[PDB]
Coordinates of C-alpha atoms in Angstrom, one line a residue:
Chain A
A3 CA -16.0 -27.2 -7.0
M4 CA -14.6 -23.8 -7.9
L5 CA -16.0 -20.8 -5.9
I6 CA -16.8 -17.5 -7.7
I7 CA -16.8 -14.4 -5.4
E8 CA -17.4 -10.8 -6.4
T9 CA -17.4 -8.8 -3.2
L10 CA -14.7 -7.8 -0.7
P11 CA -16.5 -8.9 2.5
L12 CA -17.3 -12.4 1.2
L13 CA -13.8 -13.0 0.0
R14 CA -12.2 -11.7 3.2
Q15 CA -14.4 -14.1 5.2
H16 CA -12.8 -17.0 3.1
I17 CA -9.3 -15.5 3.5
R18 CA -9.8 -15.6 7.3
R19 CA -11.0 -19.2 7.2
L20 CA -8.1 -20.3 5.0
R21 CA -5.7 -18.9 7.6
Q22 CA -7.4 -20.8 10.5
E23 CA -7.2 -23.9 8.3
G24 CA -3.5 -23.4 7.9
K25 CA -3.5 -23.5 4.1
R26 CA -0.7 -22.0 2.0
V27 CA -2.2 -19.7 -0.7
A28 CA -1.3 -18.6 -4.3
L29 CA -2.7 -15.6 -6.1
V30 CA -2.7 -15.3 -9.9
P31 CA -3.8 -11.7 -10.8
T32 CA -5.4 -11.2 -14.2
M33 CA -7.7 -9.1 -16.4
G34 CA -9.8 -11.9 -17.8
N35 CA -10.1 -13.0 -21.4
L36 CA -7.8 -15.9 -20.4
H37 CA -5.8 -18.2 -22.6
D38 CA -3.0 -20.8 -22.5
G39 CA -0.5 -18.3 -21.0
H40 CA -2.7 -17.8 -17.9
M41 CA -3.3 -21.6 -17.6
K42 CA 0.5 -22.1 -17.2
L43 CA 0.5 -19.5 -14.4
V44 CA -2.3 -21.5 -12.8
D45 CA -0.4 -24.7 -13.1
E46 CA 2.6 -23.0 -11.5
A47 CA 0.6 -21.7 -8.6
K48 CA -1.1 -25.1 -8.0
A49 CA 2.3 -26.7 -7.9
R50 CA 3.5 -24.4 -5.0
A51 CA 0.5 -23.8 -2.7
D52 CA -2.5 -25.7 -1.2
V53 CA -5.0 -23.3 -2.7
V54 CA -5.1 -21.2 -5.8
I55 CA -7.1 -18.0 -6.2
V56 CA -7.4 -16.3 -9.6
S57 CA -8.7 -12.7 -9.9
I58 CA -10.3 -11.4 -13.0
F59 CA -10.5 -7.6 -13.0
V60 CA -10.4 -5.2 -15.9
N61 CA -8.7 -2.4 -14.0
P62 CA -9.7 1.1 -15.2
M63 CA -6.8 2.7 -13.3
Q64 CA -4.1 1.1 -15.5
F65 CA -5.9 2.0 -18.8
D66 CA -4.0 4.9 -20.5
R67 CA -6.9 5.9 -22.8
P68 CA -10.7 5.7 -22.3
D69 CA -11.3 3.9 -25.6
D70 CA -9.1 1.0 -25.0
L71 CA -11.0 0.4 -21.8
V72 CA -14.5 0.2 -23.4
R73 CA -13.2 -2.2 -26.0
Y74 CA -11.4 -4.6 -23.7
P75 CA -12.8 -8.1 -24.1
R76 CA -15.0 -9.4 -21.3
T77 CA -15.6 -13.1 -21.2
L78 CA -16.4 -14.2 -17.7
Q79 CA -18.1 -17.4 -18.6
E80 CA -15.4 -18.9 -20.7
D81 CA -12.8 -17.7 -18.3
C82 CA -14.5 -19.6 -15.6
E83 CA -14.8 -22.6 -17.8
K84 CA -11.0 -22.7 -18.3
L85 CA -10.3 -22.2 -14.6
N86 CA -12.8 -24.7 -13.5
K87 CA -11.3 -27.3 -15.8
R88 CA -7.9 -26.5 -14.3
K89 CA -9.2 -27.2 -10.8
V90 CA -8.9 -23.7 -9.5
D91 CA -10.2 -23.2 -5.9
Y92 CA -11.3 -19.5 -5.9
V93 CA -12.1 -16.9 -8.7
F94 CA -12.3 -13.3 -7.5
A95 CA -14.2 -11.3 -10.0
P96 CA -15.5 -8.0 -8.7
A97 CA -17.2 -5.1 -10.4
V98 CA -15.6 -1.7 -10.9
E99 CA -17.9 -0.2 -8.3
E100 CA -16.9 -2.7 -5.7
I101 CA -13.2 -1.9 -6.1
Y102 CA -13.6 1.8 -6.9
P103 CA -17.0 2.8 -5.2
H104 CA -16.3 6.4 -5.9
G105 CA -14.3 6.4 -9.1
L106 CA -10.5 7.0 -9.5
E107 CA -10.2 10.6 -8.5
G108 CA -9.6 10.2 -4.8
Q109 CA -8.4 6.6 -4.8
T110 CA -5.4 5.9 -2.7
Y111 CA -2.6 4.9 -5.0
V112 CA 0.8 3.2 -4.8
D113 CA 3.6 4.4 -7.1
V114 CA 7.0 2.8 -7.8
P115 CA 9.3 5.6 -8.8
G116 CA 11.6 5.4 -11.8
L117 CA 10.4 2.0 -12.9
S118 CA 7.0 3.4 -13.6
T119 CA 7.9 6.2 -15.9
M120 CA 10.7 4.7 -18.0
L121 CA 10.4 2.6 -21.2
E122 CA 6.8 1.8 -21.8
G123 CA 5.9 4.1 -18.9
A124 CA 7.1 7.3 -20.5
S125 CA 4.5 7.1 -23.2
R126 CA 1.8 6.0 -20.8
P127 CA 1.3 8.3 -17.7
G128 CA -0.6 6.5 -15.0
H129 CA -0.5 3.0 -16.4
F130 CA 2.0 1.4 -14.1
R131 CA 0.6 3.3 -11.1
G132 CA -2.6 1.5 -11.9
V133 CA -0.8 -1.8 -12.0
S134 CA 1.0 -1.4 -8.6
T135 CA -2.1 0.1 -7.0
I136 CA -4.4 -2.8 -7.8
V137 CA -1.9 -5.6 -7.1
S138 CA -1.2 -3.9 -3.8
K139 CA -4.9 -3.8 -2.9
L140 CA -5.2 -7.4 -4.0
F141 CA -2.3 -8.4 -1.8
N142 CA -3.8 -6.7 1.2
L143 CA -7.1 -8.4 0.4
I144 CA -5.9 -11.9 -0.2
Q145 CA -2.6 -12.0 1.8
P146 CA -1.3 -14.7 -0.5
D147 CA 1.9 -16.6 0.3
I148 CA 2.8 -16.7 -3.4
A149 CA 1.9 -14.7 -6.4
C150 CA 2.5 -15.5 -10.1
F151 CA 3.3 -13.2 -13.0
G152 CA 4.2 -13.9 -16.6
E153 CA 7.8 -13.2 -17.6
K154 CA 6.7 -11.5 -20.8
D155 CA 5.8 -8.3 -19.0
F156 CA 9.3 -7.9 -17.7
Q157 CA 8.5 -4.3 -16.6
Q158 CA 5.4 -5.2 -14.6
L159 CA 7.4 -8.0 -13.0
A160 CA 10.1 -5.6 -11.9
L161 CA 7.6 -3.0 -10.8
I162 CA 6.0 -5.5 -8.4
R163 CA 9.3 -7.0 -7.2
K164 CA 10.5 -3.5 -6.4
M165 CA 7.2 -2.7 -4.6
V166 CA 7.3 -5.9 -2.5
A167 CA 10.8 -5.0 -1.3
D168 CA 10.2 -1.4 -0.6
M169 CA 6.8 -1.9 1.0
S170 CA 7.9 -5.0 2.9
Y171 CA 5.4 -7.6 1.6
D172 CA 6.2 -11.1 2.8
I173 CA 5.1 -12.6 -0.5
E174 CA 7.0 -14.8 -2.9
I175 CA 6.8 -13.3 -6.3
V176 CA 7.2 -16.0 -9.0
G177 CA 8.1 -15.0 -12.5
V178 CA 6.7 -17.7 -14.9
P179 CA 8.5 -18.2 -18.2
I180 CA 6.5 -17.9 -21.4
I181 CA 5.1 -20.7 -23.4
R182 CA 7.4 -21.5 -26.2
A183 CA 7.2 -23.8 -29.3
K184 CA 9.4 -26.8 -29.4
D185 CA 11.8 -24.8 -31.5
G186 CA 12.0 -21.8 -29.1
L187 CA 9.6 -19.3 -30.7
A188 CA 7.5 -17.4 -28.3
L189 CA 3.9 -18.6 -28.9
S190 CA 1.9 -15.5 -29.8
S191 CA -0.7 -13.9 -32.1
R192 CA 1.9 -12.3 -34.3
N193 CA 2.7 -15.8 -35.6
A194 CA -0.1 -15.6 -38.2
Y195 CA 1.5 -13.6 -40.9
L196 CA 4.4 -16.0 -40.9
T197 CA 4.8 -17.8 -44.2
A198 CA 5.9 -21.4 -43.8
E199 CA 9.4 -20.0 -44.8
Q200 CA 9.4 -17.2 -42.3
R201 CA 8.2 -19.6 -39.6
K202 CA 11.3 -21.7 -40.2
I203 CA 13.4 -18.6 -39.7
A204 CA 11.5 -17.2 -36.8
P205 CA 13.3 -19.2 -34.0
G206 CA 16.5 -17.3 -35.0
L207 CA 15.4 -14.5 -32.7
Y208 CA 15.5 -16.7 -29.6
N209 CA 18.8 -18.3 -30.7
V210 CA 20.4 -14.9 -31.1
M211 CA 19.1 -14.0 -27.7
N212 CA 20.5 -17.2 -26.0
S213 CA 23.9 -16.5 -27.6
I214 CA 23.9 -13.2 -25.7
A215 CA 22.9 -15.0 -22.5
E216 CA 25.8 -17.4 -22.9
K217 CA 28.2 -14.6 -23.3
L218 CA 26.9 -12.6 -20.3
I219 CA 26.6 -15.5 -17.9
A220 CA 30.3 -16.3 -18.5
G221 CA 32.1 -13.1 -17.8
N222 CA 31.5 -11.2 -21.1
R223 CA 30.9 -7.5 -20.6
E224 CA 31.7 -6.0 -24.0
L225 CA 28.1 -5.0 -24.3
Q226 CA 28.1 -2.8 -27.5
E227 CA 30.2 -5.4 -29.3
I228 CA 27.8 -8.1 -28.1
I229 CA 24.8 -6.2 -29.3
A230 CA 26.3 -5.4 -32.7
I231 CA 27.2 -9.0 -33.2
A232 CA 23.6 -9.8 -32.5
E233 CA 22.2 -7.2 -35.0
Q234 CA 24.4 -8.7 -37.7
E235 CA 23.5 -12.3 -36.8
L236 CA 19.8 -11.5 -37.2
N237 CA 20.2 -9.6 -40.5
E238 CA 22.1 -12.6 -41.9
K239 CA 19.3 -15.1 -41.0
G240 CA 16.9 -12.8 -42.9
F241 CA 15.4 -10.7 -40.1
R242 CA 15.8 -7.0 -39.9
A243 CA 16.9 -5.9 -36.5
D244 CA 14.6 -3.4 -34.9
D245 CA 16.0 -3.2 -31.4
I246 CA 18.3 -5.0 -29.0
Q247 CA 19.0 -4.1 -25.5
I248 CA 20.7 -5.3 -22.4
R249 CA 19.6 -4.0 -19.1
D250 CA 19.6 -4.7 -15.4
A251 CA 16.5 -7.0 -14.7
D252 CA 15.6 -5.3 -11.5
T253 CA 16.2 -1.6 -12.2
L254 CA 15.7 -1.7 -16.0
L255 CA 18.7 0.6 -16.1
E256 CA 22.1 0.0 -17.5
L257 CA 24.1 -3.0 -16.3
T258 CA 26.6 -2.1 -13.5
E259 CA 29.3 -3.8 -11.5
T260 CA 26.6 -4.6 -9.0
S261 CA 23.8 -6.1 -11.1
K262 CA 22.9 -9.7 -10.2
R263 CA 20.4 -10.2 -13.1
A264 CA 20.2 -9.0 -16.7
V265 CA 17.2 -8.8 -19.0
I266 CA 17.7 -9.2 -22.7
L267 CA 15.1 -7.4 -24.9
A268 CA 15.0 -7.9 -28.6
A269 CA 12.6 -7.0 -31.5
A270 CA 13.2 -7.7 -35.1
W271 CA 11.2 -7.9 -38.3
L272 CA 10.4 -10.7 -40.6
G273 CA 8.8 -9.6 -43.8
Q274 CA 6.0 -7.4 -42.5
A275 CA 5.8 -9.0 -39.1
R276 CA 7.6 -7.6 -36.1
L277 CA 8.6 -10.4 -33.5
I278 CA 9.5 -9.4 -29.9
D279 CA 11.0 -11.6 -27.2
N280 CA 12.9 -11.3 -23.9
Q281 CA 15.0 -13.3 -21.6
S282 CA 16.3 -13.0 -18.0
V283 CA 19.5 -14.3 -16.8
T284 CA 21.6 -14.6 -13.6
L285 CA 25.0 -13.0 -13.7
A286 CA 26.0 -13.0 -10.0
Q287 CA 25.0 -14.1 -6.5
Chain B
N2 CA 6.9 -12.1 28.8
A3 CA 10.0 -9.9 29.2
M4 CA 9.8 -7.0 26.7
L5 CA 11.7 -7.6 23.4
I6 CA 13.4 -4.8 21.5
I7 CA 14.1 -5.5 17.9
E8 CA 16.4 -3.4 15.7
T9 CA 16.2 -5.5 12.5
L10 CA 13.6 -6.4 9.9
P11 CA 14.5 -10.1 9.6
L12 CA 14.4 -10.6 13.4
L13 CA 11.1 -8.8 13.4
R14 CA 9.9 -10.9 10.5
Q15 CA 10.8 -14.1 12.4
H16 CA 8.8 -13.2 15.6
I17 CA 5.9 -12.1 13.4
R18 CA 5.7 -15.4 11.5
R19 CA 5.8 -17.1 14.9
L20 CA 3.0 -15.0 16.3
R21 CA 0.7 -15.7 13.3
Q22 CA 1.1 -19.5 13.6
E23 CA 0.3 -19.3 17.3
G24 CA -2.7 -17.3 16.1
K25 CA -2.1 -14.7 18.8
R26 CA -4.2 -11.5 18.2
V27 CA -1.8 -8.6 17.6
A28 CA -2.0 -4.8 18.2
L29 CA 0.1 -2.1 16.7
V30 CA 1.0 1.4 17.9
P31 CA 3.3 3.2 15.5
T32 CA 5.1 6.3 16.8
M33 CA 8.0 8.7 16.1
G34 CA 9.4 8.3 19.7
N35 CA 9.5 11.0 22.4
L36 CA 6.8 9.2 24.3
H37 CA 4.6 10.7 27.0
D38 CA 1.5 9.7 28.9
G39 CA -0.5 10.4 25.7
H40 CA 1.0 7.4 24.0
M41 CA 0.6 5.3 27.1
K42 CA -3.2 5.7 26.7
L43 CA -2.8 4.3 23.2
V44 CA -0.8 1.4 24.6
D45 CA -3.5 0.7 27.2
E46 CA -6.2 0.7 24.5
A47 CA -4.1 -1.8 22.5
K48 CA -3.5 -4.1 25.5
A49 CA -7.3 -4.2 26.0
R50 CA -8.0 -5.2 22.5
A51 CA -5.2 -7.8 21.9
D52 CA -3.1 -10.7 23.1
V53 CA 0.1 -9.0 22.1
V54 CA 1.1 -5.4 21.8
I55 CA 3.8 -4.1 19.5
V56 CA 5.0 -0.5 19.7
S57 CA 7.2 0.9 16.9
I58 CA 9.6 3.8 17.3
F59 CA 11.0 5.2 14.2
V60 CA 11.8 8.8 13.3
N61 CA 10.6 8.5 9.7
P62 CA 12.5 10.9 7.3
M63 CA 9.7 10.8 4.7
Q64 CA 7.4 12.9 7.0
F65 CA 7.8 16.1 8.8
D66 CA 8.8 15.8 12.5
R67 CA 6.1 18.2 13.8
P68 CA 6.8 19.0 17.5
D69 CA 4.5 17.9 20.3
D70 CA 3.5 20.7 22.6
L71 CA 3.1 18.2 25.5
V72 CA 6.8 17.4 25.3
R73 CA 9.2 19.7 27.0
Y74 CA 12.4 17.7 27.0
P75 CA 13.6 15.4 24.3
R76 CA 13.9 11.6 24.9
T77 CA 16.4 8.9 24.6
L78 CA 15.5 5.6 22.9
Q79 CA 16.2 4.0 26.4
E80 CA 13.9 6.4 28.1
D81 CA 11.1 5.6 25.7
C82 CA 11.7 2.0 26.3
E83 CA 11.7 2.2 30.1
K84 CA 8.2 3.8 29.8
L85 CA 7.1 1.0 27.6
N86 CA 8.5 -1.8 29.7
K87 CA 6.4 -0.5 32.7
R88 CA 3.2 -0.1 30.7
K89 CA 3.4 -3.9 29.8
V90 CA 4.3 -3.9 26.1
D91 CA 5.5 -7.1 24.4
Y92 CA 7.7 -5.9 21.5
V93 CA 9.3 -2.7 20.6
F94 CA 10.5 -2.2 17.0
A95 CA 13.2 0.4 16.7
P96 CA 15.1 0.3 13.4
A97 CA 17.7 2.7 12.1
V98 CA 17.0 4.6 8.9
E99 CA 19.5 2.6 6.9
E100 CA 17.6 -0.5 7.8
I101 CA 14.2 0.9 6.7
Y102 CA 15.6 2.8 3.8
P103 CA 18.9 1.1 3.0
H104 CA 19.2 3.0 -0.3
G105 CA 17.7 6.3 0.6
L106 CA 14.4 7.9 -0.3
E107 CA 14.9 8.6 -4.0
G108 CA 13.6 5.4 -5.4
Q109 CA 11.4 4.5 -2.4
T110 CA 7.9 3.3 -3.4
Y111 CA 5.2 5.4 -1.8
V112 CA 1.5 5.3 -0.9
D113 CA -0.4 8.5 -1.5
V114 CA -3.9 9.5 -0.4
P115 CA -5.3 12.2 -2.7
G116 CA -7.0 15.3 -1.1
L117 CA -6.5 14.3 2.5
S118 CA -2.8 14.6 2.1
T119 CA -2.8 18.1 0.4
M120 CA -5.5 19.8 2.4
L121 CA -5.1 21.7 5.7
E122 CA -1.9 20.8 7.5
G123 CA -0.7 19.1 4.3
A124 CA -1.1 22.0 1.9
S125 CA 1.9 23.7 3.6
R126 CA 4.1 20.6 3.9
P127 CA 4.3 19.0 0.5
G128 CA 5.1 15.3 0.9
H129 CA 4.4 15.0 4.6
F130 CA 1.3 12.8 4.7
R131 CA 2.7 10.8 1.8
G132 CA 5.6 9.9 4.2
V133 CA 3.0 9.0 6.8
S134 CA 0.9 6.6 4.7
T135 CA 4.0 5.0 3.3
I136 CA 5.7 4.2 6.5
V137 CA 2.4 3.1 8.0
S138 CA 1.5 0.9 5.0
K139 CA 5.0 -0.6 5.3
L140 CA 4.7 -1.2 9.0
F141 CA 1.2 -2.8 8.2
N142 CA 2.7 -5.3 5.7
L143 CA 5.7 -6.1 7.9
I144 CA 3.7 -6.6 11.0
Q145 CA 0.1 -7.6 10.0
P146 CA -1.7 -6.4 13.1
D147 CA -5.4 -7.0 13.7
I148 CA -5.8 -3.6 15.2
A149 CA -3.8 -0.3 15.2
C150 CA -4.1 2.7 17.5
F151 CA -4.0 6.4 16.6
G152 CA -4.8 9.2 18.8
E153 CA -7.8 11.4 18.1
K154 CA -5.7 14.6 18.6
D155 CA -4.0 14.4 15.2
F156 CA -7.3 14.0 13.4
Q157 CA -6.1 14.5 9.8
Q158 CA -3.7 11.6 10.2
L159 CA -6.5 9.5 11.5
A160 CA -8.7 10.2 8.5
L161 CA -5.7 9.7 6.2
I162 CA -5.0 6.3 7.6
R163 CA -8.7 5.3 7.6
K164 CA -9.0 6.3 3.9
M165 CA -5.9 4.3 3.1
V166 CA -7.2 1.2 5.0
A167 CA -10.5 1.3 3.1
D168 CA -9.0 2.1 -0.3
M169 CA -6.2 -0.4 0.0
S170 CA -8.3 -3.1 1.6
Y171 CA -6.3 -3.7 4.8
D172 CA -8.0 -6.0 7.2
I173 CA -7.0 -3.9 10.1
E174 CA -9.2 -2.3 12.8
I175 CA -8.3 1.3 13.0
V176 CA -9.1 2.4 16.6
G177 CA -9.2 6.2 17.2
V178 CA -8.2 6.9 20.8
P179 CA -9.7 9.9 22.6
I180 CA -7.4 12.5 24.2
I181 CA -6.4 12.5 27.9
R182 CA -8.5 15.0 29.9
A183 CA -8.6 16.3 33.4
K184 CA -11.2 14.9 35.8
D185 CA -13.5 17.8 34.9
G186 CA -13.3 17.6 31.1
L187 CA -10.5 20.1 30.2
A188 CA -8.0 18.8 27.7
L189 CA -4.5 18.5 29.1
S190 CA -2.3 21.1 27.4
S191 CA 0.6 23.4 27.8
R192 CA -2.0 26.1 27.1
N193 CA -3.6 25.4 30.5
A194 CA -0.6 26.9 32.3
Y195 CA -1.8 30.2 30.7
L196 CA -5.1 30.3 32.6
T197 CA -5.6 32.1 35.9
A198 CA -6.9 30.0 38.8
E199 CA -10.3 31.6 38.2
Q200 CA -10.2 31.0 34.5
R201 CA -9.5 27.3 35.3
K202 CA -12.9 27.0 36.9
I203 CA -14.3 28.1 33.5
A204 CA -12.1 26.2 31.2
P205 CA -14.2 23.0 31.3
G206 CA -16.9 24.9 29.6
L207 CA -15.2 24.3 26.3
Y208 CA -15.7 20.5 26.6
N209 CA -19.3 21.1 27.8
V210 CA -20.3 23.3 24.8
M211 CA -18.8 20.6 22.6
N212 CA -20.9 17.8 24.1
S213 CA -24.0 20.0 23.6
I214 CA -23.0 20.0 19.9
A215 CA -22.4 16.2 19.7
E216 CA -25.8 15.5 21.4
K217 CA -27.5 17.7 18.8
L218 CA -25.7 16.0 16.0
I219 CA -26.3 12.5 17.3
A220 CA -30.0 13.6 17.4
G221 CA -30.1 14.2 13.7
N222 CA -30.0 18.0 13.8
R223 CA -28.2 19.0 10.6
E224 CA -28.9 22.8 10.9
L225 CA -25.2 23.5 11.3
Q226 CA -24.8 27.3 10.9
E227 CA -27.0 27.8 13.9
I228 CA -25.8 24.9 16.0
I229 CA -22.5 26.6 15.8
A230 CA -23.9 30.1 16.4
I231 CA -25.5 28.9 19.7
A232 CA -22.2 27.4 20.8
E233 CA -20.5 30.8 20.2
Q234 CA -23.2 32.5 22.3
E235 CA -22.9 29.9 25.0
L236 CA -19.1 30.2 25.3
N237 CA -19.0 34.0 25.1
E238 CA -21.5 34.2 27.8
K239 CA -19.4 31.8 29.9
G240 CA -16.5 34.3 29.6
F241 CA -14.6 32.7 26.7
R242 CA -14.2 34.5 23.4
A243 CA -14.9 32.0 20.7
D244 CA -12.3 32.1 17.9
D245 CA -12.9 29.1 15.6
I246 CA -15.7 26.5 15.8
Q247 CA -16.1 24.0 13.0
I248 CA -17.9 20.8 12.2
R249 CA -16.7 18.5 9.4
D250 CA -17.1 15.0 8.1
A251 CA -14.4 13.1 10.1
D252 CA -13.5 10.9 7.1
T253 CA -13.4 13.5 4.3
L254 CA -12.6 16.6 6.4
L255 CA -15.2 18.4 4.1
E256 CA -18.8 19.2 4.9
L257 CA -21.4 16.9 6.3
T258 CA -23.7 15.4 3.6
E259 CA -26.6 13.0 3.6
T260 CA -24.1 10.2 3.6
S261 CA -21.6 11.3 6.3
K262 CA -21.1 8.7 9.0
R263 CA -18.8 10.4 11.5
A264 CA -18.3 14.0 12.3
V265 CA -15.5 15.9 13.9
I266 CA -16.1 19.0 16.0
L267 CA -13.1 21.3 16.1
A268 CA -13.0 24.2 18.5
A269 CA -10.7 27.1 19.7
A270 CA -11.6 29.8 22.1
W271 CA -9.7 32.4 24.1
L272 CA -9.7 32.4 27.9
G273 CA -7.5 35.0 29.4
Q274 CA -4.1 34.7 27.7
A275 CA -4.8 31.1 26.8
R276 CA -6.2 30.0 23.4
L277 CA -7.9 26.8 24.4
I278 CA -8.2 24.1 21.8
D279 CA -10.2 20.9 21.6
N280 CA -11.7 18.3 19.3
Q281 CA -14.2 15.5 19.5
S282 CA -15.5 12.7 17.3
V283 CA -19.2 12.0 16.8
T284 CA -20.7 8.8 15.4
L285 CA -23.7 9.7 13.2
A286 CA -26.9 7.7 14.0

């Protein structure tokens, strides 16, 4: 029987008991309005710990603009339905005034430099600060052994990993691979404007990406060439290449002699639909 | 039983893991070295509140190394340790910079407490308190103490750390340790050497006047402007020349309000060639 807690003191009480009981704990952090993606996360956490705690918190701090916030879906009941079905032990679902009793102005924050202002960060001051601050608070609160994040937010995942190192959190950060169709296509909302014919072609993006992985994992380092080949391969299948990038998976900067992991980002158009995907890959030890 | 001194994070990590699974109750005293009897009092308090006492010695480059007026000769790491071995401490953590910040400060994740870090002492030292909260948060995650001791003298630091503990949801008891005082009340201080013998008979009046204020406060008297005015009378008529007497919220370092819970009384007064200085915390009933 799943337990639903909304205040810091109650939860902490349980966190204390769970220690004395010697149970290994996994946290899956979320902002509610859950679906299949999150369920996979939950499976992954259940597989690696004795107890799974899921948090549901729409976190004002990471919201770039005040409108977006107001219009974020809240669906506590169905969220709990899905988590209860999945045999989740604890749901932590506090109100804003429990986490931020006095608003965001004087709130202690945690910032990861560089990672937080590059790429998506540059257009979104404060967003990633919001992400690292709340995860940080959640970590101190729950003290999990393991935490799960989806691989789709490759930047969030790198944010957190860099935080955990720098701030010395003894927590295992587990990147969970996205749900794909049997043919490779990232399952997503965008897959609606795909005509039966474009759907057949769609999986081309993930193949093109895997061809890049193959080349990189072996010792291929002619990056520009690699990328250009990829642009062309996509155009030929019928896409129109929007963007293709290869970066260091930990720093999000350019690959160097010293990178151990690469992340492959690609976006390309199919008729009037713009598919995006990504893939992480191990180049060294 | 023999005191252990650890230079490295992984060795530290190992003992820490071991301490948790023995469920030994752990106390932390973080310091920048150059130890004196002041710190020993912290150690004493920690010993009294915990099974195991850890002291950390680390000259943290993210903060400003403000000088202690009680210290007149610098210390050796071995000296600091000898002190600690006597005072019955279990572990000393003493890493090099490259160990704590193996890649420098540039990309180091930081914890920042708004307002408290930029006011008073912090206005004139950009980045100082940000270095304090960061290293302390990092020590917190690495060590996971149940309690942590800070001295009441550096009161801004103590508020800054309390605010961080609340905001970031650390399950740590922050124990503010009152200053060492002569038998008669007078704060120990280099300044004392500036009194004459006759002025030393009067010096204890500064503590006295301060208790008068505390009692008043504890007794719900919020007429501050005049509480202070009386204290000035009282000191000037004792032979002092009151310079600066203040009462603030100990957690905000701003004014008392209907909701303040703790107050700090801050006082300076001339006696002879000596500008005596003292502070005192008050718990609001």
